[PDB]
Symmetry: C2
């Protein structure tokens, strides 16, 4: 029924900063920002599709990438500071 999904956004620039803000807002609707451009979302199948379409539409595909990991869910270890 519910899935944990990890979204990793590789973004650099003015456009980049703007796109990160938008991607973060879209992911926040379904989860939490755990690093500057890494998001953990908990979603059903319909919500995953909706979110993935939205994220695909927000990035610059020449300059950015996203990876979407379906985790199905084991302690994740966080090492170091933040995020802001």
């Amino acid at each position: 029924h519910m899935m944990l999904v990890l979204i990793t956004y590789d973004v650099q620039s003015m456009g980049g900063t703007k796109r990160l803000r938008k991607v973060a807002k879209a992911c926040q609707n379904y989860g939490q920002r755990v690093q500057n451009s890494v998001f953990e979302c908990i979603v059903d199948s319909t919500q995953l599709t909706s979110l993935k379409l939205e994220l695909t539409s927000l990035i610059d595909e020449e300059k950015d990438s996203l990876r979407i990991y379906r985790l199905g869910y084991t302690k994740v270890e966080h090492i170091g500071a933040k995020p802001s």
Copy 2:
């Protein structure tokens, strides 16, 4: 026996660029760089510990963070370009 591990490195600066190079080299010993600062490693338990100690030692814990996800392993979707 073997585990897939995802390593997400939140790093910014001159020191940052240097630390990313070192983290990437450490992860390359056990896997692949799939985005600028995201690495997929396949490791046994001993290798995971060794790698995690090494990564912890390389980062600046005031300015950077790492997350280490143990995936146990479902198509990951890559959207957009790269990495360099």
